[PDB]
Amino acid sequence: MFFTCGPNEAMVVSGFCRSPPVMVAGGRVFVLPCIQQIQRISLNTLTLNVKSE
Amino acid sequence: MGNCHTVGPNEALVVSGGCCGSDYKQYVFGGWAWAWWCISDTQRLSLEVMT
């Protein structure tokens, strides 16, 4: 089955015959849903209010 | 009966017992493993940052 992510995210795929996990930023990957797992990370910027007192 | 277990890079999976012997630990850190219901148990630990 095909899985897609925007450029704002990276997809990590681990599983059968994919022991070194495949990492794709903004693309499509063919995955076995019951024998391989997909995880994601947001590439967005965070505007942090860094207080000091 | 046996199960196929998929593991993320963030996890250490330890499987005790298996195709290579009796008295041993099988070491996994992402990817996958094959486990026999009564010949090999499966236990995981997170490798993430803790602050």
From Swiss-Prot, chain A:
Q: Which residues form a coiled coil?
A: none
User: Where is the protein localized?
Assistant: Cell membrane; Endosome; Membrane, Caveola; Melanosome
Locate the Phosphoserine modifications and list their residues: 19
Subunit comment: Heterooligomeric complex of flotillin-1 and flotillin-2 and caveolin-1 and caveolin-2. Interacts with ECPAS.
The record's function comment reads: May act as a scaffolding protein within caveolar membranes, functionally participating in formation of caveolae or caveolae-like vesicles.
Family per UniProt? Belongs to the band 7/mec-2 family. Flotillin subfamily.
In its UniProt entry, what is this protein called? Flotillin-1
Full protein: residues contained: 1 to 53 of 427
